């Protein structure tokens, strides 16, 4: 049994708002109409598409509630590039975190996969177009994102640079994924430009 679509696998897994449980393989349009509403890149896209073949049992679960961010703003992370019913929105399975009361404290969150299925976890980084944009969203001028599992180590830095406008935005979002094994934990640390997981996916092959 196959899965056919008019979206991208990226936009479907991220929860692109413009896009509305078992399969052998996935076949997608070469140029889907709904890919990344906010422009950017999805890392190791083909490896992920190949991994999502012959999957059995696929269920989205909430791993980091949007309501658990007490000292950052989880409600401001929307964009006119990602409209839903004529109002600005954003990918629904990750959270674009914003400073709160002109402050962006350092985030230190971990999530231990206490299920018995593999979890596909997605996160991202925001590359603003200029230094003034970086102040307005995150306050801290010089920022990082640190990600760690038992198999993975990321120490990222956003590139503040003006790009050509795509869907109105001259900045960019870049997304990453990993398979978190049962009883391993993913550790995040950031003082800005962090697109945090909210929903993850149980994977059985």
């Amino acid at each position: 049994p196959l899965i056919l679509r008019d979206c991208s696998v990226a936009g479907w897994l991220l929860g692109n708002p413009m896009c509305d449980p078992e399969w052998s393989y996935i076949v997608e349009k070469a140029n889907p109409v709904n890919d990344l509403c906010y422009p950017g890149d999805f890392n190791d896209y083909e490896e992920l598409k190949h991994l999502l073949s012959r999957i059995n049992h696929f269920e989205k679960i909430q791993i980091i509630p949007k309501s658990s961010w007490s000292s950052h703003e989880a409600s401001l992370g929307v964009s006119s590039a990602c409209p839903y019913q004529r109002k600005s929105s954003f990918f629904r399975n990750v959270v674009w975190l914003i400073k709160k009361n002109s402050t962006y404290p350092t985030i230190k969150r971990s999530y231990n996969n206490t299920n018995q299925e593999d979890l596909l976890v997605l996160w991202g980084i925001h590359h603003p177009n200029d230094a003034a944009e970086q102040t307005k969203l995150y306050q801290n001028p010089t920022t990082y994102i640190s990600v760690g599992t038992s198999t993975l180590n990321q120490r990222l830095v956003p590139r503040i640079a003006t790009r050509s406008k795509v869907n109105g935005q001259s900045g960019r979002m870049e997304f990453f994924w990993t398979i978190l094994k049962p009883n391993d934990a993913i550790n995040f640390e950031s003082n800005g430009n962090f697109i945090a997981p909210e929903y993850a996916y149980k994977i059985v092959k």
Epitope: E73, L76, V78, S80, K87, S88, N101, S102, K136, L137
Partner: antibody
């Protein structure tokens, strides 16, 4: 129908601080993703945006006024407010509060709606 | 900051257009709004997102933008449309703010 009401008209002496408050009724200042804005009309000129503020505290100001401007929110009184320091006769204006209703980005909100009835502040010795 | 003709006029039933000239940093990069100020009242929103009307604003008011210029077209002109019309846009200069045109006083003749 959310409604906004500025505090009463008054005189401020040059170099003192102008303080105004907007009372919101018919809805919670902390409900929704709105920015709460101040806009003024200097007599015989146009409209000048002063800035706006989110209910949890972050604010954005017009760069020509930034150093003299501070706004704040009082969610318990359902109010937000404006302080403009070191005033001169150039700050004599009708001061309007308004709700920036439509978010286009985390800090860019458009569609000022509704507005208060303005309040006239005269700067004079 | 944005440039508007100080006056405009038309006779009832006509179509009148009000222009707004900006720069790359404001109209060229950002959504345009229009506000109507009737005599004795506060401004009210007429157009947001370049060409969208709020509830209660009829089709006769039409907003448009191209390049660094924006335009408001008022069809089926009525005597009650006498007002000052203001364009507005976010300006990217100096870390950003809303800016307004100087306003256009529209008179309906006859």
């Amino acid at each position: 129908q959310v409604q906004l009401q500025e505090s009463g008209p008054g005189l401020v002496k040059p170099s003192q601080t102008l303080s105004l408050t907007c009372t919101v009724s018919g809805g919670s200042i902390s409900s929704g993703t709105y920015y709460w804005s101040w806009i003024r009309h200097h007599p015989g000129k146009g409209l000048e945006w002063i800035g706006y503020i989110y209910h949890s505290g972050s604010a954005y100001y017009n760069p020509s006024l930034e150093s003299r401007v501070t706004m704040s929110v009082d969610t318990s009184k359902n109010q937000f407010s404006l302080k403009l320091s070191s005033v001169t006769a150039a700050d004599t204006a009708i001061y309007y509060c308004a709700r920036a209703e439509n978010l286009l980005s985390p800090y860019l909100a458009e569609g000022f709606d509704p507005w208060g009835q303005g309040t006239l502040v005269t700067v004079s010795s | 900051v944005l440039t508007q003709p100080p006056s405009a006029s038309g006779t009832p039933g006509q179509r009148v257009t009000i222009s707004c000239s900006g720069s790359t940093s404001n109209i060229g990069s950002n959504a345009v709004n229009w506000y109507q100020q009737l005599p004795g009242t506060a401004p009210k929103l007429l157009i947001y997102s370049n060409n969208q009307r709020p509830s209660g604003v009829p089709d006769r008011f039409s907003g448009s933008k191209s390049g660094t210029s924006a335009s408001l077209a008022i069809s089926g002109l009525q005597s009650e449309d006498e007002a000052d019309y203001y364009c507005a846009a976010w300006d990217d200069s100096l870390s950003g703010s809303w800016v307004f045109g100087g306003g256009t006083k529209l008179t309906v003749l006859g």
